[PDB]
Every structure is written in structure tokens, then in C-alpha cells.
Amino acid sequence: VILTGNSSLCPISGWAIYSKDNGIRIGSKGDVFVIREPFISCSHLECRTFFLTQGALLNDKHSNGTVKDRSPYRTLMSCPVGEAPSPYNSRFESVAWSASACHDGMGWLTIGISGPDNGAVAVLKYNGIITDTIKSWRNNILRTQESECACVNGSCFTIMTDGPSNGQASYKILKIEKGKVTKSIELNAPNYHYEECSCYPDTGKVMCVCRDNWHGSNRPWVSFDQNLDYQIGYICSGVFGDNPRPNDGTGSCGPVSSNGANGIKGFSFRYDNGVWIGRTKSTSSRSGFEMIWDPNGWTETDSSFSVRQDIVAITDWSGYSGSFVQHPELTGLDCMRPCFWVELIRGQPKENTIWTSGSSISFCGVNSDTVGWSWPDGAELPFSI
Amino acid sequence: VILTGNSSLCPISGWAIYSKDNGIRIGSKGDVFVIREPFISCSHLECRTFFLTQGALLNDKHSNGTVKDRSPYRTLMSCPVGEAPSPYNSRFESVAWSASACHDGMGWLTIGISGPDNGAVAVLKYNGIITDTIKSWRNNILRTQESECACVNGSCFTIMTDGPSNGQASYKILKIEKGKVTKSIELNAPNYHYEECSCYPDTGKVMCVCRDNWHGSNRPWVSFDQNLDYQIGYICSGVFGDNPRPNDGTGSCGPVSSNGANGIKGFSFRYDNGVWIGRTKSTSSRSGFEMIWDPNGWTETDSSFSVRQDIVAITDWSGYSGSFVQHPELTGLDCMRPCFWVELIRGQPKENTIWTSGSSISFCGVNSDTVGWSWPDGAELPFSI
Amino acid sequence: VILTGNSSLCPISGWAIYSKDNGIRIGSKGDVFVIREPFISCSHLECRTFFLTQGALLNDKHSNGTVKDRSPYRTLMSCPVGEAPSPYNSRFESVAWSASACHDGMGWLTIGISGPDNGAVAVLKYNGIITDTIKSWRNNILRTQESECACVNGSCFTIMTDGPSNGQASYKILKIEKGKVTKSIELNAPNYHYEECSCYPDTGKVMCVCRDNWHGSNRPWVSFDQNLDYQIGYICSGVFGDNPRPNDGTGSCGPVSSNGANGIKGFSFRYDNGVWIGRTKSTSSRSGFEMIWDPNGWTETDSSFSVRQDIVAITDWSGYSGSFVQHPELTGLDCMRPCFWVELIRGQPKENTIWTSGSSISFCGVNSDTVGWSWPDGAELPFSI
Amino acid sequence: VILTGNSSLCPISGWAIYSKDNGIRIGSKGDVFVIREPFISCSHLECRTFFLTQGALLNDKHSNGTVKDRSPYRTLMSCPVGEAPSPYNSRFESVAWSASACHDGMGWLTIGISGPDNGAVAVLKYNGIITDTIKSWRNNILRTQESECACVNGSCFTIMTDGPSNGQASYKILKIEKGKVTKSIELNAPNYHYEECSCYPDTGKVMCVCRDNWHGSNRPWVSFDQNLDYQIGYICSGVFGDNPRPNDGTGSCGPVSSNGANGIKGFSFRYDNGVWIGRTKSTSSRSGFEMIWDPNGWTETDSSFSVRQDIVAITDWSGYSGSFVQHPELTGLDCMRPCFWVELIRGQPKENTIWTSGSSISFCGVNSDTVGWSWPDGAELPFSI
Numbered sequence A, B, C, D: 001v002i003l004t005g006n007s008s009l010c011p012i013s014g015w016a017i018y019s020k021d022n023g024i025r026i027g028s029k030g031d032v033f034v035i036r037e038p039f040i041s042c043s044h045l046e047c048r049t050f051f052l053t054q055g056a057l058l059n060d061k062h063s064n065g066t067v068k069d070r071s072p073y074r075t076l077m078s079c080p081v082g083e084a085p086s087p088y089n090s091r092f093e094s095v096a097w098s099a100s101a102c103h104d105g106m107g108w109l110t111i112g113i114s115g116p117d118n119g120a121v122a123v124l125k126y127n128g129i130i131t132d133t134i135k136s137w138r139n140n141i142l143r144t145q146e147s148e149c150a151c152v153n154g155s156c157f158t159i160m161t162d163g164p165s166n167g168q169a170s171y172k173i174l175k176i177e178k179g180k181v182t183k184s185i186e187l188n189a190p191n192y193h194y195e196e197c198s199c200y201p202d203t204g205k206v207m208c209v210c211r212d213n214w215h216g217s218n219r220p221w222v223s224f225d226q227n228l229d230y231q232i233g234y235i236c237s238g239v240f241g242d243n244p245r246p247n248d249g250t251g252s253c254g255p256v257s258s259n260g261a262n263g264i265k266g267f268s269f270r271y272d273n274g275v276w277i278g279r280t281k282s283t284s285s286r287s288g289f290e291m292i293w294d295p296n297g298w299t300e301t302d303s304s305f306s307v308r309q310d311i312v313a314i315t316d317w318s319g320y321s322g323s324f325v326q327h328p329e330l331t332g333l334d335c336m337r338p339c340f341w342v343e344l345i346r347g348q349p350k351e352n353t354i355w356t357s358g359s360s361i362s363f364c365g366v367n368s369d370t371v372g373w374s375w376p377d378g379a380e381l382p383f384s385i
Ligand SMILES: *[C@@H]1O[C@H](CO)[C@@H](O[C@@H]2O[C@H](CO)[C@@H](O[C@H]3O[C@H](CO)[C@@H](O)[C@H](O[C@H]4O[C@H](CO)[C@@H](O)[C@H](O)[C@@H]4O)[C@@H]3O)[C@H](O)[C@H]2NC(C)=O)[C@H](O)[C@H]1NC(C)=O
Pocket: A061, A064, A065, A066, A354
């Protein structure tokens, strides 16, 4: 089976809870990796949580966070959805301090970037075998999604950035077939900033919603077909999606400069001119999480919206979030099902531990009754070490 | 292969021990979840233990049992029958503080209820994919079996309650096909109370024996066909099945008010006008367990019975119990095999630990020689934390 | 595939080492069961180590050996050959304080005896489903092999004993087909004593070599065809096989009374009128282990032998031992391959720990070069708890 | 599918990182074996890490490294590539203090040598079943590759040494078919010394690059066809491959006596008259690692080379290294892909711990962009025990 990727997004009314791993609570006693970016991706058969670890466990001296983010120890691993990430249940994928993965219907593509800041190399694997490499073209921290790539009709697609995180950088779309790059194009995007894209397939094309770390408190997007013919923009809604951000107000279809520097990995789903935005509840802190349906929010700049569904209370820590889909080949549906995961970050810099880790929760979009609540991490910090 | 569910219960004389997990004894040293309701359910290929955890391990601070029962941390997980429930051998099923699961011959149906007391939502999954949701209709702790649902001819069936635990509530039978609710009916059951139903298939229909928490010390039952044409009653035997309960005496085919408030999840199997009742040995405490064959106990009110088989001594803790079956498709028999599990609850409120957990034992009904004994939990409490 | 069991034992010259699990050394730090009787049995596909645990781990208070041997906590579990027996790698088989298991080519038969001393019940499972039970007929500790049953032509065979361990008891051969007892016969064996038989298939029949705990320092044997037509005797060699035993001398084809009380589970392989005897090196202590080829030792009473191969030095602890075979269906050979395992018992009563456990080693018979050595347990006792 | 082994080495420009297990960092907290020689080998389906353990865990008293290398506790085990080697994820292979393994397309061949120094026996297994033994022919530490054997056209091939480690010894090539030795030949190699060969298939033949422990600071090699018609030599490059070694200078096509005694397991790949040499960065210590492309280094004695790629910085420990390949049957390529692993040795003698263990990294040769870096072990020593 190659996933066709030709279906359109399912009609939905809200979000039903799909998983919660309690990784940090369990890690208080069990042997659980210190992790970041616990992104989900699915095949035609099953779903997995991918993550990066510093190859260190919770409640151990090696969890000391002072280790640079981009270390030679960092690896991309995966485990079944909803399980604490342990060396006893986790598959090794790639050596990586920035990553993506996705399944095309026939096998897993994983992308893992390691190496020095001035010459990082992305190693691409398909079915665990090295199939290609991509080296840094601007010599300044080649980096990728930290969530699932998108697959349509036997090709898979991702976005990579190279250059400053605080100014203009360079952004490329890659088309990958059985783990080999067969096409790429650089975005002609002056004044845009793309990091940490959340990309999903929809109607034979791909939509990516990303993080502007330079000068945007709304989210940039890029969409493209199988030929890499692309469009770019920012989400117009005055319901601002980044963190930090200003209070909701008048949006812009370009980068909103107020509170624009810095950011958080996030996602959104476009439905016609409307948008489901996932975002933190706080405008200043990585706290809380909510889903907002803004029926004109893709193209219109008002701060009006119609539905809010709570996911994590503002009194609890959240973190990165990303899209994942479930294809008809997996679900038996006639439409592409949208889902998302949230990383619940504990420890530094907000809390007094030597380490920083996340646990995860995830939700799937359904057209049936749902409810808002708070499903926070739940660990009591500090631990012993 | 869909399970037909058209066979009648096997002729049996007694109960042969099937499993014992020693979960709590193992968890004194190993990495074992704090759990409750370790219910067994089987496919055409294998049997699993399902359970709810607060996503915390024995001998750890997060096991602190002051946490609400209905917490956002609670998850339904499963592991192979007879193994200690660990993060290293347990599959994630659903986020849930009340649950059921069963296999239809083709895939697993899991039902996990989470969300707030005033608006809980049951998430249904078939083969791990969300297929439906059911929202609270009385805004008062939507809740379900805590043991296996029953499947017949490609549909599976369960009971949900919404409303007070100490007065009249609302009870519904759900018919589910490949994870989708295709029919439901509310029981017209004034003066009845149904919680925590133990439901099994028998001759193309389903029988549920439940817990009246309001005002009955005998057990309510409901039976129904594939169309949800139902019958209701209480078990007539003066061999009372609930805990607490009075001493054995004259029964009633309606709710026996003496010691009727409160209760424990349990089960019974109807054979003609007779009944096998599983029950605690104590009338006041969750202590001991025994199987009683009362050959007229379904419909007659005397306190006479013909066989008692000891399962757990009165000097040892017991707990929840439930039915599960093994279908002909699994066993190769021409009849439906009755089995049951018993949860052996340790810790709070009876014992001085910060936590409450159960281990489990299980038995299958056989027409060959058996013996009574005591197979208790066996852990030495307290631990270290 | 049903295993035919029609081949004869392979020609061999010695024993090549097959596995060593280091269970107790690993258990010093890891989560490893306290176990006894780590017997191996194989299918047409793979080999497993079966064992009994008290459902307690090494370095834990629950390992306290003062627990009766015949406890309600004891379970039969299995793990892959050569792996430390852990709750994280071990399959649950049966609740049992005495056990057997074997594969017929189509599925696993397990036999697990639990219950009280005066009315123990053997639960038989095939493919993990209960298929039969056998209750104590003398009301005095029904008990079985503690090693693999033997399968020939789709039937499997075992020996059970009921009665005194220090005087005349009752001994039965059972023929089991797909987990159902289809035939049994009681041995007419006055003055014989059979416990803990080690039984293997050979040329369409079964040979069992056992332990006389009453008054024999040589080993009793029983052989039988598929109809349960049997013969009985004792191994004639003056190379005495039990522990304790006298120094080698003149044997007897009946029970050798000198040092005859007490014993140890062991095995031997008959080749024509010759015998491969496995035995401890000490005559008084469960110390050392060696294989001895006595070319006339089955039928003749001299103490002469031709080959000794060391297995464990006399300065190291050994323990129970048993036969297992590998059938042509597994190996591709034209003959039945003999193998054996040895349990290396550590702790009480010989050593100052609260617990008693064994690790294991195993060897297969080959017609190619081999060498004698010592492969002892290797743990340094006591542990922390 | 038998692996043909008829393809020639893939054209490559550099080495892409394939795995990193972080074994020692993880073992600071988790249950991880003390290991040595973590060699990788692959089938037509997957790659595994094989390793020797003393059957003891990190942070435990049994890790005490005063134990002989050649102990009866040492076992060959395997786990998936990139996972910490634990008792919970590792398969048992053989009892062994020296080993090799490889897959022929149909099953795994494992070779494990145990027994005393004066009479060691190699036990060969195919699909886990004993298929042959080879006994010491010089009664002086029979020993083998400590990395994968090489398979071509249904036969697999290895090298064994018997005799002094500090003088002339005896060297044999073995040809093995389905686990059975079908041919062997002794090398007529006066004044050569072969230990710890790294052997790979290439164009229907096999090339082994080895360690001269007697009197060579360059590496000896032997190549042979399927008939065991062989050639011998030393790598001519003045870029010396052993450790210890002199500074680069004039090489020799025979053994380079300067700093020739002692050595380290290593590998090299021949391309035409050129060579990729993997080596430590230090000439005196097992520190650093680098890959050097010397385009005439197989046959010419100059110290010129054209490419250096850094793998581990000189300020970090390295250790043993070996070749492994990925066959077309696995990769879908039309050429034989070269890979290598490096063992990163921590503990004794260089560091103050009771133990010595290695973690691992591995790389595959690619014709696409790569980068040099340092991917060292990363553990902070000592631990607690
Ligand atoms: C998590 O990682 C952190 C970074 O690695 C650790 O913090 C560091 O701790 C070290 C202690 O090893 C400390 O080192 C220096 O501290 C002083 C500088 O302000 C200085 O006085 C010290 O110099 C003395 O000691 C060293 C021996 O290491 C000798 O070489 C010197 O001659 C002298 O005697 C020393 O250089 C760092 O300051 C500190 N890093 C920073 C910048 O925060 C944490 O310890 C670790 N956390 C845990 C819990 O392990």
C-alpha cells in the first residue's frame, strides 16, 4: 500500500483524547528517558511516538540539562503511543539533534540531523537503511520539523531551515521518494521566518504551519503540490498562535511584529477560510493549551472566533505541539483525520531540577461529542537526582 | 472470523485456577504500576488483562492515593494474563477513569471514559483507532462496566450509567459495531440501580449481573437480545451476592434493602433457574472469596445452596470481581466457557500505605475435578514508600 | 507438524555447552525472579526455559525462603533460553508448585499442580487454554516431573506421584492428547520409589529416569510404549547416580539401600546396555556435576566406566538436573538429540541468605570434539536483602 | 534467499552516522550489561549488535573487572542496533569468551568459544541449534574475530588463531555451510601474526584485515575465494593502522616492527590499490578515531593520503572497531555497502572504576555529503559502584 494522500480533511466538531503517556510520573521510579519533542506518526497499521533523547534517564546525573541541545549523544528513538519512553520499550532510529519521520504506506522514512553547527548533515533512512544525506548549505544549524513529515502518493515532504534563528534564514522544501531526495526548492521568502514546521497532507497537497522565531507572533505557513509549486503566507487571524504573543487583536496576513521574537513549535489546520488553532493559554509563558475554531481565521484579520476547547489548564505547563494525521488506509474512513500531540515540558528553566523533559498527550479530531478538560503532566518535582 | 456467540454456557462442576499475577509482591522490587480493576478479556487467539492505572508505580511518591479516582492521569492499559503490570510489558489503550473492552473476533473494542464529572466522554476505539464518542447525558459521572463487554455475531454490547450512586440513576444498553454505536436504549428501571455490570454472551443474547449501590444487597441483572429487547430483575437467592450484605436469609426478586447501600463490583452466571454466585466471604468487609452453586437461586428466594468452593480465605483481602468468557473460536469447544477474575486489593483504606493497588487471580469453569483453597495477594505491607 | 518421536537417540561422544543464563549474577542488580527448577523444553521452532517462582524478586523481602515450597504464590513461567528470568521477559504459564511442560509439534502442553497437600489438582493447558484437570488420588502431595514431558506421534506422556516421599507411594503414567488425559495406568511397583522423573522420547517409546527418595541411591526408571505397556527397573551401574549416595561399588538392578533416603532430581540416557549418567561430584552435598559414559551401566553392576566429562567443579554448587531433547523437526537431523540442563542452586540451606534460587546451564550431546570445564553460578553472596 | 555476495563494494566518499547506543550513559541508572566487542551484523532483514558480557550489570559488584577475560560466565548475546544492551532486550546466543556471527540469507550462524585455555572448543550454531564444534589444535587459547563472519553464495567464512599472542601462532580459514565446517586450510604464514580479523565479502571472495599482536604496527590481511585459495600480505601504507604504532612514515608490505608488539582489533576496506583505514587518533593510547582514504595505500608505502574524516576526538576514548556490510538483499542496491562500528571503552585500566565496558557507534559508507565530528561515549565516571 502506498498512501494516496488524496482525501480531504474530515469534518470535525472537536477533539477526543487519544493518548497520555505519564512518562515523567512513571520515570520517578522506572527507567525512563529524559526526552523532548514526543511527536506521533502513523503507518497504515499503527502509530508510534518518536522523540529525541540525550541518551540519559530521569533520576540520573546524566540528565543534567547543561548538556548542549545539539550534542553528539542525542538520538531519535520511537516507542508505541501512550507508553513511557524507556530503553526497554524504545526502538533506535537515528543519531539526531533535530528530526522528522513519516511512513509512505510501504516503509518508514526517518530524518536525523547531527554534526557540528557549521556543517550539520541530515541522514535519511528508509526501513532503517541509509538512503541519502543532505548537508548544511548555509553552515548555520541545519534543522527540521521536530514532527512528522507528510506523505502523498509515494513521495514524502519536509521543510528544512539553515541560517539565523533571529533574522532572515534560508528555507527549503524537500521531496523524498523511498528515502532519496528527488527534488528540492528554496522558498523565496524575504521577511518570512520558518522553523519547526507542522506539515500534513490534504487533497493531494501538503500544508505546513510553522514557527517564526524572528519577528512574527502569528504563524507562517507554506503549502505545495507534488511538483513543489508552493504558496506562502501567515495565518491572518487576530487570535495569535505563537508563544510569546500579544493579546488577541487585529491580525495580519504578514508577520505580526508585536512580541514576534522567539516562539514555540505549534500547528494549525486549515478548513476553507477557517482554521483550528492550537495554542498555549498564556501569552507569555509555555502554560496551558487550547484548541480554537476561527471560521474565517485563515484569511481574515478579526480576533473573533466561535469555539474554544480546553486541553491543559493555564496553571499547568505545556510546550511544543504538532500535527499528525491518520490516513484512510489506517482508519477505513473516506477522509484524512487530523490529530495533534502536545508536549508537557517539566524542569528547567521554569522548575528547579537539573533536567528538562516532556511527557505527552494527543487528541484526534472527531465529528461527535467531545469535552474540554485539563490533562496535565502530573509529576511532582523535584525528583531525587 | 467474527465470534458467533450462539453457544450456551458449558456444563461445569467447579472452578480451575487459570492465572495469578503476584503483581504487588513483584512490585515490592520491580517497576510495577499501581492499578485497579484488572479485568480479563479474550480474543479468538489470546487473553489479556486490562487495568486502570494512575500512571504511577508501586514504591513511588506518585502512588499517593489521595489523588481523585477520576483523574486526568488515569489510563486504561493491558498486559498478558498472569504478568505483573509494568511499563515494560503493558500496552496503552485509552485515557480513562472508567472502562470496558472486548474482542469481536476481528478486533479489539476499547471504551475509556475521561473528562469532568459534569460532562464525561466515553471514547470508543476499534483496533486502537477512535471510532465514536458518547457524552454524559445526565451530567453526573458517566461510567461503565470495569470488565469486558460482550460480543455476539459482530456486535458488542455494554451498559453505561449516568446519575447518582446513592439514588435513582439512568442506565443504557449500547450496541456497538466495529467501534460505532449503532443502537441504544434506556432501561425503564424505576427503583433499580445498575453499576459496574459484568456481562457475558449466552445463546445469542447477553446477560449482565451488576451492582446496586443504592438499596440492594442482592445483585440486579439485565439480559437482552441483539435488538436490545431486554428483561430486568434481581437475583432471587437468599444467598446474597453484594458486599456489604445481610446474613443469608429470605431473598427477593427485587432489591433487598437490608445493608443495600454501597456495594462491590461482582458477577454471577445463570444456568436455567440456578446460579453460580461469586462473592466475598465477609458480609461487611472486602475479605475472602467463594463460588456458590445455588441450583434454584436465580428465581427462588430460599437461602439453600448445594456447593461452596473456596477461592480466598476470609482472613485475606479480596475486591472487585468480574466474568469473562472463552468462545468456541478460541477453545475449540462447542460451548461458551465461563471464567472469572478477582482483584485482591491492598493498601488504603484497610492498610497503612500511601497507595491502593490490586493484584489478580482468575479461574475457569470446568466439568472435571477441582479443589477449594486460598490464593491471596501475599504481599507484606507496607513497602518503603 | 506433529513430532513423530520415532527416531532413535543420536550417536554422541560428549556434551557441548548450549546455554548459561547468569540469572543470579544479573539479579544482583536487575529485576530477576527467585526461581527453582529451570527446565528446558523445545518445540519444532524454539526452546524455552520453564521455571517456578514464588512471585518474588532477588534482593527483595518477599524472597524470604521461609515461604512453604507449596504456596499459593508459586507459578510456572517461561522465558527464552539463556536469559535471566525477569517479570519483563517471562510469560505466565500456570499457577503451580509442581510442574511439567512439553510441545507436541502443534502446541504447548503445560501441567501445573496447586491446591492443598490433601487434595492438590493438576491443571492441564494446551495453547494456554485449560483442557483437563487431574486431582490427587492418595491425598498426599500430588506431584510431577519438574522437567519436560515427552511427546510421540501427537500424544504426550508424564509421570505423577501421590503419597509419602519417605516410603511406598503411588505412581501413574498419563497419556495426554491436545491437553486431555486419554489414558492412565498405575505402576505395579512395590519397593520402588518414583519422583521427579526425567522423561524423553526414543524410537516411538518413552524412557523416564527418576529419583528414589525412599531407599535407593541408584535411579529408578520406567519405559513405556504409546499404549502405556510399561517396564520398570533401576539403573544397574555401580556408578551411583543419586545424591546422597555411597562411593562407587557394586550396583544393583533394584534399589541400592546404602545412603538411599533423600535424593536429587536427575536424569540419565540409555544407549543399548550403556548409560550416560549425569551426577553431582560430591556423594554427600549438591556440589559439582559430571557426565559419565558407562558402556554397560544400564544392565551390569560393576563400577567401571569409560568417559568422565566435567561440567561443574566439586567446589561449586549444582542442583537439580533434567533431560530435554531436540526432535528432527527442530534440528533437521535424522536422530533424536539428547540435551540436559543443570540448576545451580544458591542460598539456603547451604549459604547465609534469606532466599534460595537457582541459575542454569545446559548442554547438548554431539558426535564432535568437546571439553570438560566448570561453568558454575558465579554470584557472590549474600546480596543486600 | 541465500545472499549471493557477488557484488563489489559501493563507491563512497565518506561515512554517515548509522547508530549510537549511549549504553554506558543509560547504564548509570538503567539495567545494562557490562559488555565488550559490540559488533554489528545484518541479515537480509535487519541488523543486530552482538556483544560479550560477563553476565553482570553496570553499577553492580559483579562488574568487578578482575575476573579473567576468559571466564565461564562470558556469553555472546545480541540486541537491536542502537539500544542499550540490557537483560530485558537482549537475546542469548552462545556461551563464549571469543565469538563471531553472520547471516547467510537463511539463518544466523553464531560461533562461541569457551572452555579452558589448553583445550577451548568453538560451538557453532545455525538458527540457535548446535551444528558443529571445533576444538583447539595448538592448546593455546583458540580464538576468533570478535566481529562478523562473511557469507557468500550460501557458505560463511571466518578465521581462527591458536597459539602465542606474542610470537608465531597458527591461523586457519574455515568455510561453514549451514553451521557445519565443510573445509578448512591453515595459512602458511611464517613471520605473520593474525588475530581479531575483520572480514567482509567482495565480488564473490572474502577480504580479512586483522591485528598483528607480535611484531607489526601495520595490519595483516588475508583474502580468499570460496575454495579457500588464499593470498596474504600486510597493508603497505605508511599511514599505520594499528595501536600502538609509530608516527606515519615509510610503510612495508610485510610487518612493520616499530611499535609492532600489542595492537587493537580494527579493519580496513580495499578499493583497487587504495584503502580506507579506520584507526585511533593517538599513536600510543586507544584514543580518538578517524577514517583515512589513502588512494594507493594497499600496495604503496608512502605516508601520503587524500582524505581524513574525524569520528571521535583524540581527547575521548575509543577501542575496538570492525567492518560489517549490508548486502544488496537488504539494501536494494547493486553493490556491497561497507559499514563499521567502533567500541568506546570506559573504565579500567585508564579510569578509576571497578569495571571495563564499551558503548558503541557505527557508520555506513555513502557517496553523498558527510561530515567529520566527535561522537564519544559521554558517560561521567565513576558511577556509584
Ligand atoms: C550540571 O552541569 C553543570 C555544568 O557542567 C555543573 O555546573 C558546574 O559545576 C562545576 C563543578 O565541577 C563548576 O566548576 C568550577 O566552579 C568554579 C567557577 O566559578 C571554580 O571555583 C572551580 O574551580 C575549582 O575546581 C576545579 C575542579 O573541577 C579545578 O579544576 C580548579 O583548579 C579549582 O579547584 C570550577 O572550575 C562550574 O562553575 C559549574 N558550571 C556552571 C557555569 O554553572 C553542575 O555541577 C551539574 N549539576 C549537577 C547536580 O551535577
